[PDB]
Design a protein around this ligand. Structure first.
Ligand SMILES: O=C1CCN1c1cccc(CN2CCN(Cc3ccc(Br)cc3)CC2)c1
Ligand SMILES: O=C1CCN1c1cccc(CN2CCN(Cc3ccc(Br)cc3)CC2)c1
Ligand SMILES: [Cl-]
Ligand SMILES: [Cl-]
Ligand SMILES: [Cl-]
Ligand SMILES: [Cl-]
Ligand SMILES: [Cl-]
Ligand SMILES: [Cl-]
Ligand code: NA
Ligand code: NA
Lengths: 820, 821
């Protein structure tokens, strides 16, 4: 077995090779189905969606016509009709009754009507700019669902509202002064703080009440539930600003693990409008008792909203350890006006009855961790003293499943008149019913756009899941009344990302597999006459057609092996291009390995991981293995590294690498490299530190070197509080074990974005500080204008060029063998 | 000629080699002579001085006895007597002659002792006496009051305080700064030199005691302190990462970048009334009768300041922004009035001051190149009321720094303040009665880095350091200031000397060395023949610090020189490879600084600071160092070569010098030349690779200036002018704007930078990297996370030396480096 050596290209030649092979647009998303209601016309629905028409284009609203019938011999490509004519849209709001779109595009907030009482346009609409007296950028605009004339938005960390008809603009909260410095004033209203956006994927912090309360005057009362945050006690850090000419650093509140999270509470803005759209008064209201007293043990407001009738506000609440979840109904009557006069304040507390109380309709615990998701459906309230809902959970079985729950809304044992504090279980509602809708060794999905859609007429629930395979997401449907058979609606051989129409007669799937790039197709749903419970599907039309299998991309093979740990572990193998018999090639292991991610699945990897194919063309074996802790395999699989991050991941990587090495003689174990970003860069350092016998080179991108520097929401979920896991934090932090790195140079390469807000450069800078003390060699590349991503394409081109060149000169080439 | 390939040591082996070969203390300095006045005793003087006793000991005060006579057959070694006892690191000290009071800071504490005064001379170590305080924070810059040695002054939280060391009274004089408030709002200070003044003009203090006390009718006195008051509110704020990397933070400070605002400055005076028993009566803070901008037209920087010997006038040396105009100005105490926010009382105090009292610009000069500030300025005792007599040094006349005796007429000004108009530029200018050149020639007098003059007013002589015999050696000279002609050299040739003359002018001490021999310190007695007091001879008296001798692990370089095509003789240093094999050519490593205010090539011992150039020679590298045009100690025309043109002329001299050696010596392999330097040296290392990639294979740039707009006002504008008036000078001189010119070959560029550098900020490197990334160019990078323009932690220095040797090995010297292309 002779060693294969890669072609030793120059720096200029590699740049040219990369540029030639480099020669993606956002696929259609955020779908919405509006009915035509026109018996004579040829179309049943109009679908609205966001997309990028090409690579250089901006993301904008489009529409397409869904025909009542189709020529089944042919295939129908729906044409993309532009909705707007502006002189970049991330999301949009819509009001069904009026047909009013509301969206932000650049600095402006705009509105237009389509598909309401005023009909359907046949050409692009010029949008109407919403007026404002506010100087700064307006964020997070939302239509009031009870009245489409009123919008809300955030400006300088305070909630405003504006009327698009009458032009009245009113500030609702006076919590932040923009002029003063952020050290004194660190309060905000209606905005999710850093940890909740970054680690819980909640981006909004205020919620319109869906219904208006009519007054005796002839006007009405609109309500806004919102989060008020106080970040005064949260640690401040200084990250370097993008304007490098201005040699300065921007401040922001980063709650590092162990330290204080923001001080949180619920508030409610009660807005009185008169008979013809004019504001009478705005009453800001607060909880009758403090947040800490009413919600014992709660750190995080994970999710929040309203019930369909607007009777209760709801919220999903977590404790600090993220092992307890509570779903709590909060009545508007629990809020009283904000008064500083102590005599007047005491009367308002007495005016609220003792029967009005927080209602904990669901509670659960786990020894592993609670994974927050977006699934939560509340049914219409039939009985006054009951509430019925669907929720998803891993806590019963260790796999996420849908459960139909009915909770009794008791009057509480605790009485506020006595003047005491409520015990832990005083607000807990008894569970009348708890039926499992789904079950098995597979999970229902509720993240990254995956959710349920409930058909209340047919009494069905649509959902995404891993039932047929952990490598493919599929759409399913099942009854929530007499749950039993789970009917798969998507075709095997692809992994699907689905969106179901609100009318439950259509669904769209964005699908791909290892060989075929992404397609988006529309499918019509229908039942047999004899049984509404049964659901069949039929292909209706293509929205986005694939270009076909790319001629200059060879996809990998998915393999698997039975681990000594007890689990089946899956991997991807890129064989070298033009594989010579009786020769062994250098091997680059690409890794992420952290939680909430799965690299190995049946999806098209030729866009995001296109350069793994490029490595194979140069003559590298490329391997990707999903170790224990990774996503879509249940909570027991995911819980393997609890309190133990860094300690088990590389065992699975080496085990899988040795499985391939014995089964394929062309893998040269003497020249194995490892590379990854974020958690991947972390594990790449751990790989070289723990197993220098296996791994010759390690290229660590944006590595977490020191877990005390990372945030609360993430780190405490998987590693607990630093005091309760002294050893896990030490053993899991590579910066603390600098002496264990090799004394040989050309084995360690550190890559980091200089302006990184998530994984700060200090992780690298402190690692380097200890590497200097330990007398250890290292290589370093900095990307001075990057923030945990590739904003500027030149820095991405330079990264790719350097990595190929580094792997060439220190792993693959003939010179690399001579250099040792 | 075969190429020599250096031995390919591993990383662990080079660490061992450097650890073994690594196996210094401050030599005696800040000397002072005090006479015994004891006829029966054997000693004439006692010398006090600061010195480090050994390798790992603190810097502290010592004394030695100077005997009246010596055995001229023998060589006397003076023993070091410790002045101070061990406490329950002294950088400098004050002394008061009439009382014998020492004052000095040692750690946080300010201490005092007494010796050599009326109370006599100790024969054992004195216990230091702490100056007690109620101030919460570290006290800075303590100074004895020359008028009354009971009083001291110091800075605390950017304000001036005074403390009586006998009565223990303590008082704050200025209320300009608020320690509790943040620096964005409160950017004012008093008695403190700001960043640019400390870093670019070597002024470390911002307040000056008046040396005489005005007596009152009551039987008390008035003490006075002149001080600078700075307002840094409009100055650019920058954030450098704090030493504590645990808290992901950056410390703010005021950095006036080129072309932006310097601090708003003015003179103030604290009038301090003391009663008959040493108690403070009152403190009156006082300000200039008109603003600083009105009285001192065109002035940006207060370069130097102080008082005349009688305390009649305060003086100051003032520069304009371009640094092409110097002004020496006398400022009377009567120009200051008390601070009064009341509008009617303020107007009455202005009217009480006469119109005759006015600023007195006793000297002015200009230049098309630049003003180099120095510490030479000597005011004689005032004989006539309408005259002032003084010695000063300048390059403005001839282009070399020389001493000039000047007499200026103190004219009552034409401008009158009662008219209510602003003065014209020349209204405060004094006429020059006399301007006699004391020295002259194609060589300079030295007035910086400790070099100054000693003026014997009895014999009417002036001692000074200069470059008359050679630009490669510093020497002590003496000459009359009445009838200047003969310049007598006092120090011996073959060494470069650094000298301190006694206040009595009958002794001098010289710290001397040469390329072959380490540093010595020796005492020399001065005397004259009875017939001619002008004629000065010297005689070795005693050794203070004996040399360790030429240690066996260091082979020093040979000083060479070549006649350049530019018309200047350019000097250099050459380290030949150790065990030089015949018929072989070795890889070369050019070490460079090449910026202004520095000379690397001279006849001094280089085996301490540049020990590792010898280590590079031992591994088999040729090491070259060349003082290009712009460097120090060769006159102002030589220095002015790169005005507006930094980065453009320096590498021509480096390559020309390299090619001189290449023709003269066949052992220099021009195919394998490396370049390396720190600061301006790192800047030129980049420029060398950028411009002459044909000559230089590798460049190792340390803390490089990559963008001149990022560097401060005082330095950049002196050499390059204002950015607006020299757009292409700044462009051509900034490597970050010319990133496309770097090589596409990797393993040729290595950047080194201290992450916490406050002088040449890491931003220089990060913005260079920004443009290198855009241009698609390769680079190597090493950061030192806990360093700031120096090596304070030994581990970072050890890592630097290891990586540098290994980099040169793997990408220049070794056999594998040749195959790697
Ligand atoms: O911070 C910063 C600065 C850049 N960056 C950052 C951080 C996290 C993720 C990503 C995006 N991944 C980059 C790596 N990609 C695979 C890949 C393998 C081999 C080769 Br060759 C090229 C690409 C997947 C996407 C970038
Ligand atoms: O910033 C920073 C961080 C370090 N640093 C900095 C900046 C300016 C000056 C100096 C001190 N010089 C360091 C280099 N020395 C010659 C030398 C050549 C080869 C070898 Br190998 C070792 C030493 C002379 C003294 C250090
Ligand atoms: Cl079931
Ligand atoms: Cl129902
Ligand atoms: Cl000694
Ligand atoms: Cl003369
Ligand atoms: Cl005289
Ligand atoms: Cl010019
Ligand atoms: Na996110
Ligand atoms: Na200095």
């Amino acid at each position: 077995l002779e060693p294969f050596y890669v072609e030793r290209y120059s720096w200029s030649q590699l740049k040219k090779l990369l540029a030639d092979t480099r020669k993606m647009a956002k696929a259609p998303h955020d779908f919405m189905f509006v009915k035509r209601n026109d018996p004579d016309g040829p179309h049943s629905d109009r679908i609205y969606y966001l997309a990028m028409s090409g690579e250089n284009r901006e993301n904008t609203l489009f529409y397409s016509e869904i025909p009542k019938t189709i020529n089944r011999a042919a295939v129908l490509m729906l044409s993309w009709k532009p909705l707007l004519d502006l002189f970049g849209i991330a999301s949009y709001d819509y009001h069904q009754g009026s047909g009013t779109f509301l969206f932000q595009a650049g600095s402006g907030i705009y509105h237009v009507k389509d598909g309401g009482p005023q009909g359907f346009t046949q050409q692009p609409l010029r949008p109407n700019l919403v007026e404002t007296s506010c100087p700064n950028i307006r964020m997070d605009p939302k239509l009031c669902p009870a009245d489409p004339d009123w919008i809300a938005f955030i400006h300088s960390n305070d909630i405003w509202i504006s009327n698009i008809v009458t032009r009245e603009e009113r500030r609702l909260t006076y919590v932040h002064n923009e002029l003063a410095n952020m050290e004194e004033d660190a309060r905000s209203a209606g905005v999710a703080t850093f940890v909740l956006q970054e680690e819980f994927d909640r981006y909004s912090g205020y919620w319109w009440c869906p219904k208006a309360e009519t007054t005796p005057s002839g006007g009405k009362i609109l309500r806004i539930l919102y989060e008020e945050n106080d970040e005064s006690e949260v640690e401040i850090i200084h990250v370097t600003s993008p304007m490098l000419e201005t040699r300065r650093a921007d401040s922001f509140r980063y709650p590092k693990t162990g330290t204080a999270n923001p001080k949180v509470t619920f508030k409610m803005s009660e807005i009185m409008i008169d008979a013809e759209g004019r504001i009478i008064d705005v009453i800001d209201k607060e909880l009758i008792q403090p947040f800490e007293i009413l919600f014992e043990g709660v750190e995080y407001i994970a999710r929040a909203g309203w019930t369909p009738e607007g009777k209760y506000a709801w919220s999903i609440l977590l404790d600090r350890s993220q092992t307890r979840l509570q779903i709590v109904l909060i009545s508007p009557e629990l809020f009283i006006p904000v008064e500083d006069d102590v005599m007047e304040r005491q009367r308002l507390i007495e005016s609220v009855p003792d029967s009005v109380t927080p209602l904990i309709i669901y509670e659960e615990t786990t020894d592993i961790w609670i994974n927050i998701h977006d699934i939560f459906h509340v049914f219409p309230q039939s009985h006054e003293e009951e509430i019925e809902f669907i929720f998803a959970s891993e806590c019963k079985t260790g796999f996420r499943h849908l459960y139909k729950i009915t909770s009794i809304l008791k009057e509480s044992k605790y009485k506020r008149s006595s003047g005491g504090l409520p015990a832990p279980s005083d607000f807990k509602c008894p569970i009348k019913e708890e039926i499992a809708i789904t079950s098995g060794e597979w999970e229902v999905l509720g993240r990254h756009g995956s959710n349920i859609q409930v058909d209340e007429v047919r009494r069905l629930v649509y959902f995404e899941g891993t039932k047929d395979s952990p490598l493919e997401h599929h759409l399913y449907v099942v009854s929530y009344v007499n749950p039993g058979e789970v009917t798969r609606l998507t075709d095997r051989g692809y992994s699907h990302s689905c969106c179901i129409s609100q009318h439950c007669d259509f669904f769209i799937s964005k699908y791909s597999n290892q060989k075929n790039p992404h397609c988006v197709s529309l499918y019509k749903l229908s039942s047999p006459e004899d049984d509404p419970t049964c659901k069949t599907k039929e292909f209706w039309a293509t929205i986005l057609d694939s270009a076909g299998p790319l001629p200059d991309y060879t996809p990998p093979e998915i393999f698997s092996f039975e681990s000594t740990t007890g689990f089946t572990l899956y991997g991807m193998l890129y064989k070298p291009h033009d594989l010579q018999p009786g020769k062994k090639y250098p091997t680059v292991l690409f890794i992420y390995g952290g939680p909430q991610v799965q690299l190995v699945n049946n999806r098209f990897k030729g866009v995001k991981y296109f350069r793994l194919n490029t490595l194979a063309s140069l003559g590298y074996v490329v391997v990707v293995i999903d170790n224990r802790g990774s996503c879509h395999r249940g909570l027991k699989f995911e819980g393997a590294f609890k309190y133990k991050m860094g300690q088990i991941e590389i065992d699975d990587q080496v085990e899988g690498l040795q499985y391939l090495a014995s089964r394929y003689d062309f893998i040269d174990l003497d020249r194995v490299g490892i590379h990854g970003w974020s958690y991947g860069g972390y594990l790449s350092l751990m790989a070289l530190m723990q197993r220098s016998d296996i791994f010759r080179v390690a290229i660590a991108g944006a590595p977490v070197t020191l877990w005390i520097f990372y945030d609360t929401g993430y780190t405490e979920r998987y590693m607990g509080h630093p005091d309760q896991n002294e050893q896990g934090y030490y053993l899991g932090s590579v910066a603390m074990q600098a002496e264990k790195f090799p004394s040989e140079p050309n084995r360690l390469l550190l890559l980091h974005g200089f302006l990184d807000e998530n994984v700060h450069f200090a992780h690298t800078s402190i690692l380097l500080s200890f590497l200097v003390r330990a007398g250890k060699p290292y290589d370093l590349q900095i990307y001075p204008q990057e923030r945990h991503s590739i904003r500027v394409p030149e820095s991405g081109e330079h990264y790719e060029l350097h990595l190929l060149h580094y792997l060439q000169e220190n792993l693959g080439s003939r010179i690399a063998a001579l250099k040792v």
